[PDB]
Paper text:
The tumor suppressor p53 is inactivated by mutation in about half of all cancer cases. Most p53 cancer mutations are missense mutations clustering in the DNA-binding domain (DBD). Due to its low intrinsic stability, the human p53 DBD is very susceptible to inactivation by destabilizing mutations, resulting in unfolding, followed by rapid aggregation at body temperature. Here, we have systematically analyzed the structural and stability effects of all oncogenic Tyr-to-Cys mutations (Y126C, Y163C, Y205C, Y220C, [name], and Y236C) in the p53 DNA-binding domain (DBD).
The [name] mutation is particularly prevalent in chronic lymphocytic leukemia, where it has been associated with chlorambucil treatment. The crystal structures of the [name] and Y236C mutants revealed that both mutations induce a substantial loss of hydrophobic interactions, resulting in the formation/expansion of internal cavities in the hydrophobic core of the DBD, without affecting its overall architecture, and, as such, these mutants represent classical ts mutants. In the [name] mutant, the side chain of Ile232, next to Cys234, was flipped relative to its orientation in the wild type, with the CD atom extending into the void created by the large-to-small mutation. Minor shifts of 0.7–0.9 Å were also observed for the side chain of Val197 lining the pocket. The net result is a modest expansion of the internal cavity volume near the space previously occupied by the phenolic side chain of Tyr234. The [name] mutation induces a modest expansion of small preexisting cavities, with a flip of the Ile232 side chain filling some of the void created by the loss of the aromatic side chain of Tyr234. The drastically different stability loss induced by the [name] and Y236C mutation (ΔTm of 8 vs 17 °C) is particularly interesting, given that the two mutations affect the same region of the hydrophobic core. Here, ATO had a much more stabilizing effect on Y236C (maximal stabilization by 4.1 ± 1.0 °C) than on [name] (maximal stabilization by 2.2 ± 0.5 °C). In those experiments, the [name] mutant showed both conformational and functional rescue, monitored with the conformation-specific antibody PAb1620 and by reporter gene assay, respectively. [name] and Y236C, which are destabilized via the formation of internal cavities, are classical ts mutants with the potential to be reactivated with generic stabilizers.
Numbering used by the authors: 96 to 292
The structure:
Amino acid sequence: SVPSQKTYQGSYGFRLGFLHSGTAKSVTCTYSPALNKLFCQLAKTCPVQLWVDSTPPPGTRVRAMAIYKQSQHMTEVVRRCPHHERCSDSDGLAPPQHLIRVEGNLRAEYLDDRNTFRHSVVVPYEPPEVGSDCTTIHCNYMCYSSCMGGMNRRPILTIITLEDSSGNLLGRDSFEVRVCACPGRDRRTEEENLRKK
Ligand SMILES: [Zn+2]
């Protein structure tokens, strides 16, 4: 009833990476290593790097799913709020209820789990292109953390799983997400709060 969040590199040495975008007031997406937390604006591009030590088999896939970070909310499906699920901002593939989209990938598939009702998005794993050392996916988060009737100020985690063609686990990583108006200022504030503690 709760997806695992245990980091697992697996046989291929799978792990995520993030750009170093800084904390200027104008930044639209920024990652805090100290907090393991991504801060981003609503519906903006969030680059997430996929790193491996060796190339997994053809048919490997990459899935993203959100869960509530606090244990007392972990069994509740993370979904878009009653406003945003009705705002007709569809991209043609993502159901309007899904918080996480992978943008610019025509092979993205969106799953409503028939048993858990949880949402996820899954794309084929592509090995890095010539001259690159990693593969980058571009995620969008389609509600603010503060959206009433949705996340409702509750922190979430994104879990990224590397899966075989049957959906079996090959690797797992995760990060907290805050979707907010000013990611640069919020990252600075939370990093200062951590330093004071
Ligand atoms: Zn919303």
